[PDB]
Paper text:
In mammals, DNA methylation occurs in the CpG dinucleotide and is considered to affect the structure and stability of the nucleosome, which is the basic architecture in chromatin. In this study, we reconstituted nucleosomes with methylated and unmethylated human satellite 2 DNA fragments, in which the CpG sites are reportedly hypomethylated in cellular carcinomas.
We crystallized the nucleosomes containing the methylated Sat2L (145 base pairs) and Sat2R (146 base pairs) DNA fragments and determined their structures at 2.63 Å and 3.15 Å resolutions, respectively. In addition, the DNA binding path in the methylated Sat2R nucleosome was not different from that in the unmethylated R nucleosome. The histone octamer structures in the nucleosomes containing the methylated Sat2R and Sat2L DNAs were the same as that in the nucleosome containing the unmethylated Sat2R DNA. Since the nucleosomes were packed in a nested manner in the crystals, the additional methyl groups of the 5-methyl-cytosines were not visible in these nucleosome structures. Therefore, we mapped the 5-methyl-cytosine locations on these nucleosome structures in two nested orientations. Interestingly, in the Sat2R nucleosome, most of the 5-methyl-cytosines tended to be exposed to the solvent. In contrast, the MNase susceptibility of the Sat2R nucleosome was enhanced upon DNA methylation. Therefore, these data indicate that DNA hypermethylation enhances the DNA end flexibility of the Sat2R nucleosome, but reduces that of the Sat2L nucleosome. However, the DNA methylation oppositely affected the DNA end flexibility of the major Sat2R nucleosome.
Residue numbers in the entry:
A (entry chain F): 19 to 102
B (entry chain B): 25 to 102
C (entry chain E): 38 to 134
D (entry chain A): 41 to 134
E (entry chain C): 14 to 118
F (entry chain G): 15 to 117
G (entry chain D): 32 to 124
H (entry chain H): 33 to 124
Write the structure that this text describes.
Amino acid sequence: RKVLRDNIQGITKPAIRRLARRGGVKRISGLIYEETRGVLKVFLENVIRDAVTYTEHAKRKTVTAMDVVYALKRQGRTLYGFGG
Amino acid sequence: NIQGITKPAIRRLARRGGVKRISGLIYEETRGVLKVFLENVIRDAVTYTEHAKRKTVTAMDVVYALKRQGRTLYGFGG
Amino acid sequence: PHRYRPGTVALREIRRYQKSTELLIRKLPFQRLVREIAQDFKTDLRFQSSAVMALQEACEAYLVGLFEDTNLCAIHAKRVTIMPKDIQLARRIRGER
Amino acid sequence: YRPGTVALREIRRYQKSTELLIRKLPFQRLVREIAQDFKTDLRFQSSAVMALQEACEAYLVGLFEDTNLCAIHAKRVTIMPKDIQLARRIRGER
Amino acid sequence: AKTRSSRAGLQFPVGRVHRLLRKGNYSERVGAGAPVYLAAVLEYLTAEILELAGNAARDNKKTRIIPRHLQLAIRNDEELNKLLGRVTIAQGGVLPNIQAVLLPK
Amino acid sequence: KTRSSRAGLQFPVGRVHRLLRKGNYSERVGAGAPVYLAAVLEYLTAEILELAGNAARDNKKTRIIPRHLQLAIRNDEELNKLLGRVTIAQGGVLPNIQAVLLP
Amino acid sequence: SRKESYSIYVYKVLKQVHPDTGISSKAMGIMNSFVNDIFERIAGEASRLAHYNKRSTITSREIQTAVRLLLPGELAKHAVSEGTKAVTKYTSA
Amino acid sequence: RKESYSIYVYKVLKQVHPDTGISSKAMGIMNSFVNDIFERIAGEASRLAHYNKRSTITSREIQTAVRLLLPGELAKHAVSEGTKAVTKYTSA
DNA sequence: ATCCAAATGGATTCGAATGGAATCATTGAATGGAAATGAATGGAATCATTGGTTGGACTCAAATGGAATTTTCGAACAGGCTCAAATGGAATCTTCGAATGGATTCGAATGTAATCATTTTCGAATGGATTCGAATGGAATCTGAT
DNA sequence: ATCAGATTCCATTCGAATCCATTCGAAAATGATTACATTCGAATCCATTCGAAGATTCCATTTGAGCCTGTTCGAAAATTCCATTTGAGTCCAACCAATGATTCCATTCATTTCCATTCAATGATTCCATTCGAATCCATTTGGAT
């Protein structure tokens, strides 16, 4: 498969802008869209790391939504609706 | 007794947090927040004390309470 | 031609998305991004669609929450606009730094 | 001595110290009152009131550093209740 | 041939909650009344959440509860919100709140 | 003759084994888990005690009292992250003073 | 592939409260997440409870003081009630 | 009766720093540290054994537990010190 | 207050994915007769704390005095909102091979379990200490005016 | 800036006092040790599930023009808050005298644990039923310009 480089830029200016709306934000500065993609990255790393560690104590090479779940739980952000 | 915690004690606690200047309405808000804290902790503390059917709070119970609140304490045995 | 004045399609949009629950990041760009983070973590990994859906969900949750707290940091300093300085204050008091 | 730098010197005074910054047990006065509004004929271990005071002032120094950052963020050098409420709201305590 | 869910007047299976207490290694032995009292707290909590949800379900004109309704149910009930402070609902949404200072002059 | 020596550790391995069975963690406890764990505990204490000793004296005091422990933990990023949610008795704060407030 | 869920009982308790209204399988999911989360928070809290006092069994008293410890305010009251009666009605055969 | 780690933290201390000792308050803090950490690790191991539904905690569980709790290279160094302790134990 | 313009509701209808039944079969609650514990049970030393009353001593509570932080303005600057035409690529569909799970068989290798006997570890005093609270002298420092 | 006088830290020695040190007996703990149990680490053959790729529609993405207003600007006004002495007010800590409240036994009964051995409960199936995800519309805005 093709190389995976630079997908954090698929999170566009508008998608970040909506996510500002539903959080109740009026005017969005220019320096925000980089700073958003920054924090989102850190976030998804810490969760995806922790998901995959579960996957491979599980000795599976498919990440289960349960492992996404446990991961999130471990982080202090409990998620409902994917518990199966 | 909430004012037995005086203005000087409060301002010192403001110092160790590294603050320059203190507002007049602060000490009030302080006594408020300390009160809510000491309340949520002591409540959980006491629940630990008398599930034990003991009516004296052990420092272990304060520790457990603090653990349950998410503010962990080291040095009293927990 | 008419121009709605600065800020009032913004309010229209806050009420727009707050009254909806749809996922706000476009699903495929996200899905790649997850495969990149996951792969440059570990290789030859496969996902359940429920597992990226789970992710994106938790993610927009996380982000929209942070955006509310950021906006309060904006308001507190008497600004109408969120800056990075705000996000760094929000995540500092949230204890993420 | 000029305004504001006996404040700095005092910052260094107490940060360079670990002393309990609230007096004795006017604190435990307050502790026993709060406690008996929960249950009566209660007794404390001296270690347990010390424990409380400890975690409590710890808590307060935390809230004061965060509030102080809120003060700075608003261009101000002085902490106001508005600050304490912003801090306590972001922490999720409200 | 008596089921325990009847004997305490509950819908939530008490026998199950007993098995799950043992299969979870919470302590080596389980009293007879602990699974009961707990199946009670869970059935009660379910009940409370479900008919708070129904309220906003029919205030948005719908015969059926979708996660949104649940989310609005929890977020508007102070004690439940507090209980679920760290929980995030699948497909939940937010409360239509707008900070005051952002309204026109 | 203790398993701690046979694994080369100072931290009691037998104790950790018992404390694993009676802590209700699962009905069965592997043979290597208590060892590996007693190791992580000896190591982590060790790391702490050493960073604590270093920071114990640049100020020339005999031994590690709580403050020394505090400065040890709060100065080492990985420890501070691990223990961010812990509060040390008699700890203190790092002498930080925000710049905007300096002369 | 067959094992467990609470969906039956959330469905009945649903008909008890709001007999008109139905439930969509996603929102049903979120309820499963809720029962599971809560079962776990309570049983853990109870288990550390038995442990701090050095006793090998979990009783109703334990589940109770667990419920008093987790739940905020008035649903903590309402819960202790609902349980205390579930139990006293139980020991009655 | 009853237990404390003060013995082994004292040994480990002078093994590491034969220069320095410890004041009983800081000793307490250390006991608390060991207890907290033991607890976090063992619990994470226990849910780990549960999420994949197996009745034993092995070295392997303690391991992905430690990878899960400890940040970065303190996790790597830790996996080490323990992974060696175990084979040198098992070699008899 | 005025007519005007895109946008916002929320009430009509349309084929379709979603929910909620009835039905057959696999687990799992549940009976019920011994096996093993568990918690009070009344009965006792022991510890660990309420309780006053005691002095030197900071530590507090007020109240002068002014000095700079905060507020409020009013002005200059620029950044972000808004709109519109191209078009990029997501979203949808439906295909399809087979890597990767998974139910279920299966046994050597691993962890329990009484049951002992040996030693480690605790607690409690007993003998050098190690740093607390002064003692000041000296940069070091802060800040008032030739 | 390098005077210029005070507080003030910032340390080099002292005579002590609150611990920690190693010692020094008396449980509770670990480690073996044969003797059972069990868990799974080890082979399969099924079966979900996912990765992929091509194609066609049009929903959004982007990008740049244009300018309103929100940020930061420097300044000017008003006020809350630091520094500083003085009153006295309540602490530090000091033992110290008392019997409540722990908590540890050496008994028993009630309670939970087992373990087959069935009894319903529950969960997986289609199985064909309805809210509803789209679809326009104009009532009702609501907007910003007259």
